[PDB]
């Protein structure tokens, strides 16, 4: 399972979304150092382009294998191979936009395969997302909690706005291996710090190039117990 | 165009907590009486590991009784029909989004639902199949540049005696140009959705809805 | 029964919204069995307020609901000892209000004491920018729960410019009379129309009128 | 600033949760530049409480955060005419607490005043049934806004039987003194561990230790 994810790994994705009515589809092509926690992947909007909303809200649909897990904090995601794993997410924007996606991860030919299917609705016509007034996400810390053999993630994220300020978004994810969790080693409560940046945009966001660095940790601070 | 008797057909794809499924329905009703019954099959992914009640409202806005002075946004929209899109937020954290297309094809109402549900607690009246249908409800409809926005607090009755509350937000959007629709003011739709019959671990379900629109009749 | 066809009410309210402190009082009258009342409200300390008074409108009387025959009136049965309510209002743009009240009866006058705390009201939103024009009429749903009633209500403020600011209400109503001395209603609905009738001096004098009528679901069944 | 190696606090709190009025005070001591402190909390009135004390844990100290050099400390610059916070806490089972706080400095000593109001905590849920086992460690993201700060914090209470109960926190932090008499931080994080050390007499007496350390995002930026 460890011995299967490799010091350089590749991802191909297929995606199928609808946001405020607008159907679309995307693919991507990706690579990174999983054990160093880094990846970059190139995204296309194969159908539905150009999109009438800020691409940024989709940014986090495109990779939980590429988290740097230190020795002695179990990697739920790498362990889950060769079967793979699946996440379920709800994103709730402070202005009423709501997004829900289910993603399917798996491996084939030493190449990671993501199937995404998402559904966005109730985004205000006048608001920064439907106005394309977003300038990318702030770094974030996700807390992962073990629960029923899965992990539940929580994350308060914030999208940067033109003029300054931020649009806030709450994330709630459920991560579920497809191995039996009797064949797994669960971590405790732990934290994943990230910074996801757009590094290239083209043809009105129908081509987008993204980099993530993700590092996991236990809470380092001294107890009194 | 919308006759005093109308038939509907429904195809539905969904996913709830990663469990994928499909349904279809054949429905019959009285668009101007505000009544209908429809016969639902789960045809992939059944039997379902959660209460089918949470999908009840996925399965018909053309069947609301609109009194004479109160413009009917749904019946007006034909022949080109309308769409809706909804979020349901349960008080225990489960969230469903859903999108719907309503069209009119050679006399029949055709419905197409895609939905996606996540974060339902595992234990968990929804996931432990401990629900006993919805209470009657009142939806408030607000015009909102050219579409309607609905707001509704609903509650599922529970095995044991309580209620699981759920907050609905929906956006109704006519495919017709807005200039060809008289827009209603703010109004209310009182409903009672009931389960008539179920068989084979909720893989077959019959539902009946009655639904009557009104202005606020209180004086001023 | 101690609820007459005509009753008066007296209110004292103490409040903090985004850290701005204030107090109100009111004297009101209405017709309990017809479902109508008028309250004359003063902002007696901390005025004029830096926020839309409209958010406070629903803080000012459940005894005045018209209950039809065979729908138990939880609030009128609660006397002589009365009842309390606790409410959370969550606005769609982040404002949140918690509030609690006491309703009692002294010398046949209804007496309301209200405490409230409101926070996180955005500086550029319609509440703080004073852009609201009153509430839409509404339906509150009431559910029996372990001796009390849980109320649920999605509401909306009209805005300058035409749209609405939505608000979510969750209230718990608890009788001060032991519960087996009351007949509880099943699940039911309260239709309302609350309106501002007059105002003066930068929104520091307000009069409001409520009509409220309860009903069971009237639609046919099976 | 005027905040010494060692500092004490006294605190007075009054509030209502699901109708139940109470009042609290703490005496306190700690080290503000290594961001640690202990607080000995007394339920003077309304004891014992029908609800879990844990839900008040965070009501009881923003100057005791360790800020590294190069990240402005809003709270230490915000003195002598100090600062305030207004918080909303939304538990996933429906409990909602609002609360507001005053932080002033009067002759060697930190003064805390808190008023809170909690409603809609379900009667059969862990808070009213007292099935909680403390808070998990947390991180707060703090954003500049109008020369104030907005804190956002997903937090979790350990439960009996092993689950968690989650609670969303939103807090506005506002200095009582103007700008510029003060430098603003950028978007930054505070990592925290709150621990109950000692409990007595059905939760009427309680000792809390907090370690709080701020940082910027430490990760590589490709832009």
Author numbering:
A (entry chain A): 5 to 66, 70 to 232
B (entry chain D): 8 to 66, 70 to 230
C (entry chain C): 7 to 66, 70 to 231
D (entry chain B): 7 to 66, 70 to 232
Please give the exact wording used by the authors of the publication that reports this structure.
Unlike dyes and QDs, FPs are genetically encoded and can be particularly useful in live cell FRET imaging. In all FRET biosensors, choosing optimal FRET pairs (donor and acceptor fluorophores) are key to the high performance of biosensors in living cells. Indeed, the variety of engineered FPs with improved optical properties has made it possible to tailor FPs for FRET pairs with high FRET efficiency and develop highly sensitive FRET biosensors. Given that the chromophores of autofluorescent FPs (directly from amino acids of protein sequence) are centrally buried in the β-barrel structure with a diameter of about 2.4 nm, the effective distance for autofluorescent FP-based FRET pairs is less than 7 nm, resulting in practical maximal FRET efficiencies of 40%–55%.
With the development of two-photon FLIM (2pFLIM), FRET imaging has been extended from cultured cells to living animals. Due to the limited number of FLIM-FRET pairs, however, it has been difficult to simultaneously image two molecular events with 2pFLIM in vivo. Developing new FLIM-FRET pairs compatible with existing pairs is required. Many 2pFLIM sensors use EGFP or mEGFP as donors due to efficient FRET with RFPs and high photostability under 2P excitation, and it would be useful to develop a new FRET pair compatible with GFP-based 2pFLIM-FRET pairs that would enable imaging of multiple biochemical events in the same cell in vivo. For this purpose, a cyan-excitable orange or red FP like CyOFP1 would be a good starting point as a donor, as a single 2P excitation wavelength, for example, 940 nm, could excite both donors. CyOFP1 has an unusually high QY of 0.76 and decays as a single exponential with a long lifetime of 3.66 ns, which makes it attractive as a 2pFLIM-FRET donor, but also has some bleed-through in the emission channel for EGFP and is not fully monomeric. A red-shifted monomeric CyOFP1 paired with a far-red acceptor with high EC, for example mCardinal, could function with a GFP-based 2pFLIM-FRET pair to monitor two molecular activities simultaneously in vivo.
